[model samples]
Target: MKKKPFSILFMGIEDYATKGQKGRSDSLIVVTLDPKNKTMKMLSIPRDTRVQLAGDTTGSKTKINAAYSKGGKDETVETVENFLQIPIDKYVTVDFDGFKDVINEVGGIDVDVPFDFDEKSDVRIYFKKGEMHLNGEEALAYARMRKRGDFGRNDRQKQILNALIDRMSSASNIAKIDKIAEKASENVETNIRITEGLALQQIYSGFTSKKIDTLSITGSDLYLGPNNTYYFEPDATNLEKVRKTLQEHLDYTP
Candidate 1:
């Protein structure tokens, strides 16, 4: 018997701590996991990537990020599903603080910096090319750096997440399992039920970076005059390739 392939939409919030405000998702990544097939595909939609507003009837298209605040989690998930034409089985939302908490909970992560750069956000960090250790604060800078634009930030977001996946897979993290669970429960939100989570735990825990195929939806840039309104017009050629590849993984039968 084989388990059904499913998708998980991992939304990262724009604000680390929103107080009482419901914030927009700064990052939108959909991971299709198929442990039954030993395969996975991770696709990220750029925040500025254009899409028809989820519930819009006025014929308007806006950045995918706006869906979160415009219609909340449901709409955000809908937007991603619509764009990729794939079924979304589950979703998990984590904010900046939530991410930091996970990093802190797991002790830390080691990332392979793509280039030398400095970022000044709530904290400051210098990342030189190559591999190194990153604490919560340093990892925040690595993920939140906008100097290279949304695409850059999107890639960086996946980097830390990938690192987290690798670290959490280790047996050493068992020593702090209780604390990690508490920290995650406090800062993260998901609709996954206890029974379902238990059933899926083995599949999720066994995930490795090697099984992941990372991709980004690229497009032509359109900048409007006011406030530099930016929209990424989807590239049909690239998108078709991406769509085909993703569908294969989703439709795989063991």
Candidate 2:
């Protein structure tokens, strides 16, 4: 691997509020790199977590996802930065169509289904508790499956992301690199430049695929709003523990 720059940012929707609309970013992740030690950490933030919304005239408490609808990407970015007390320099927003296309281009992804469940509209999904290859549609179903609700979906999303990363990092995946890059360019919107992306890719090539770390903010769901906005109420003590673990791993304090 070569040297690479490291940074953190929030990934989420630019708009929220419309009912039955697609293209909203319901997920948030903080990606950090430690080039000195060749380590990468991804922290996923549930979109529905409760937080203070900056630039609000009414000052009403609402789910963090609402920030996107109320203020767009800049607001969403600022709100997460303020909540975490961290600098968010870049962001990437992936709509549902984009997500589906990317997954298809990557030859889909492989995931482990923990249980059998049916999604809406009689979409029956049957898979055992083992590794299984998924097409774009199945992958989407896996991501949206929330039999246990958002937390379960979050866990599944992480699994899918890890699987995709693992596949992408493999030597066999080099053949698909160009395809991946093309799809990424077309489907993903981000503040990071192309040169920066390639530079990071070069630096990231050295890590063992198995060594990457993934985590979710520690929290429980809280229902709010007339439309039943679900929010995550993080356990402060446990969340602190998570923070400490990440800080020690990166040899940096937040």
Candidate 3:
């Protein structure tokens, strides 16, 4: 199968207010699609994984999430590229606000909630363990709920993403292409041009099946200072394993 010419970075900010703050990316996912085979793979990098930042940044090792807050999307993209030694073609940044709007515009999302949990303030959720339909606010709450903390939230985010993609691929959405396009262009900011986005969808449309693979870097957790600055100290051995897996899966020459 031919590898797609593009790689997309989907970054989620836990707190958009921290755009200029010292530390922040709640979640970072790098997605590469193989258009010929209709396959897509995701690489999820933990927020707290320590890494070196480029261009005279503070600290020998800074939290991965902080890349955006310190330098915005470009800086964050550069940091991840440096860390993995991979080329990033385009990026799409989505804050909680945008996420909610897009989900609401799509009507709602249907997802399988692994467990039941209370919704956060200003947000409401109504769903059972099985398959359930969730509105924008509820979907945001579902993805943000970290009952088990960040790990749980990460899982929920992935579920929501998968559900959203499935809905986008459905025949009903095809009829609403113009509406979807308008919403996407308004809500999604990317290095990719509008034409590129259309071409990408066309390529992905030829695929026969879709599969999702998940991998997390295992490490020790630490609480820093009085603010409870939680950090995940990645095990060197495990980090190497993850790096290799990502390279192989993504078909990197390195």
Candidate 4:
């Protein structure tokens, strides 16, 4: 069988703030896999980065995270594809509840904190620097903190993702997939078929965090709108570099 490159858009959906509000994608990460090279590239996009929302006769520009709430995966996928100038083979969306459930299912994960800080919310939990083991709630707090800014939050989220991948890839935990999948199915939505998932797992079972390359789009902060809403405007050259990196990674053969 011929191995080809593919990409997946992983989105973290926020829960409704009120009783009837639709959730937005609070996290957006594009992961490109090239099995031939045994490499995986992860590109994390800021939730507030402005982009042209897809699926409208008349286009509108807004934060990229709004795409999911606007039209679910269809809008989010098309918007990302149009932005990166690449095809998204599949997509996965999981809300915070499901996220914690999966973490708990995998018996939690160990993450290295960049610095010591307490979560900036009512339920403040202090995180120490260096190595630490986080449970579902603690992990959620760690990823949701924004006192250090969006870029900092992005880095933390990627760290958690890598930790999750490492934990899930372990041979001992492979048998827990059924329970993990069931716990996630309640709130997770993915276009990947069961067979396709098994195939992917089989191929990448030996993959580890060392093979992953993390990338981020550089940008500046801007405030707009009547309420002075915040937005992250990506630098043009930085974005072009990311696009080219992904293109070459996918284009390479043998």
Candidate 5:
């Protein structure tokens, strides 16, 4: 239940315009931070993960993203809790505009792409299999890529995330702290107070050197009949490993 040695839910929403439409959560990830241990682990949950929606008693299963649409932050966080059996202390939610601005504010960054692919989002970006420096708009396209499926997109998101963190984790970024704070306040919605955020600034300043361990949930594609729609069915064995590892990291037990 402690906020420190915390579990942070970093969420991305696909909605950017218009009132007639709603969008599912594009990304759902847990950032387990151990400031004392000087480490953090990022684990991504595929958007199409098939599970029971939290607080749904209809017994209908749906993708994880559906939970977000159904109940915004509360239901989404609860659904993740039911799946991972982990306590989430805070959430940071943002959209496409916010994503691009943060990257541009950092004066752009470089990512070592693992493979060659062209991404088509609001903008088109071609990523070659090597180091590529990207501006704000390019970074947005890179993160939104799902042509390689949610798994690969998730990897690219984490890759870009680490790159951006490295850029923000420096003393130079410290000089731009006020500007960054303004952008964040305008873009992000989080429960962490000013004092809490100020405290974290110190913790993560030393945190850039820590390695970010990445992992994905193991599952296979499954189609629910009637509509023949597909979803990711998680492997119980692998899920157990993740639970144990995260619990160990948090010094928590269920």
Candidate 6:
């Protein structure tokens, strides 16, 4: 075992809109695990954040999510690594279908919504403030809502992930890991091996939301290009702050 803190990038691929087509990364999150400290940190990177795609010959800028659509996981990881100035040791990706399946299998999750809002998708779901139980479909809408802008959306996405973790940790059926893994393999992809995951899980069996710290990069909205497409430009100072925080977290031994 490496016995060292490491970082992993988790992404939600939005290719379900059209099967057989490559989709952009709808959500991006970077997680750093510090077993020595028995704590973990999660940072959600706004998909709309403007960035220069890694390994691109052209110097033009595009949304960070475009990295996946352009060159898949490699480009996404490279762009995120350069943007955050942090080394990503692994990556996990799941499509919409897989996301729902796992959540459903977990018997739903509890989320404390920040405000009352109606998700206006093909199916409308109204979510009220305070604690609410969300099924797979409602959870999907909750995470995919963009009316709150990327910042709010990022927060919601993190909420969902945290909730999922909480559900799994407390689930009585957790022993069925084999069945869950078999089901999740349908649409989930990752570089982490099954053994590695189980090892980490064992080491962090006591982990909970209380030990987790959430990080976000503050930014402003920008309109660029001839069409004036909107993009979120992360604030330089805050971005640097996040970079340093993550770097220190990953380098810390205790």
lDDT of 2 by residue, 130-178 (tens): 7789877677766776641367766777777677656655534443565
TM-score of 1: 0.85
Among all windows of 10 consecutive residues in model 3, the one with the lowest summed lDDT is 205-214
The deviation in Å at residue 28 for candidate 4 is: 0.3
How far out, in Å, is residue 229 in model 2?
6.2
Off by over 4 Å in 3: 1-3, 14-23, 56-58, 121-124, 172-175, 206-210, 223-229, 248-251
What's the distance in Å from true for residue 139, model 4?
1.2
Candidate 2: give the clashing pairs: 16-69
lDDT of 3 at 52: 86
Clashing pairs in 1: none
TM for every model, in the order presented, reads 0.85, 0.79, 0.83, 0.85, 0.87, 0.87
Backbone collisions counted per model:
0, 1, 4, 0, 0, 0
| Better-scoring candidate (TM-score), 1 or 5 | 5
Where does candidate 4 stray beyond 4 Å?
16-21, 120-124, 172-186, 225-227, 252-254
Q: Model 5: residues >4 Å from true position, as ranges?
A: 1-3, 16-22, 120-124, 172-175
Ranking by lDDT: 6, 4, 5, 1, 3, 2
Measured with C-alpha atoms, the lDDT of residue 100 in candidate 3 is 80
For model 1, what is the C-alpha lDDT against the true structure?
Answer: 0.76
lDDT by residue (62-96, candidate 4, tens digit) is: 89988777777788899998778778887888777
Residue lDDT tens for model 3, 28-60: 887766555566766677777777876746667
Q: Provide the overall lDDT of each model, using Cα atoms, as 2-decimal numbers.
A: 0.76, 0.65, 0.70, 0.78, 0.77, 0.80
Of 3 and 5, the candidate ahead on TM-score is 5
Tens digit of per-residue lDDT, candidate 6, span 1-254: 47699998999986833434457998999999887776789999888898888887678888999888877888899999988898999998888777877677767779999999998653379999999998878888888887624777778888888876665454444457646655655567888876676566566665677668888878888887798889988899998888989889899322
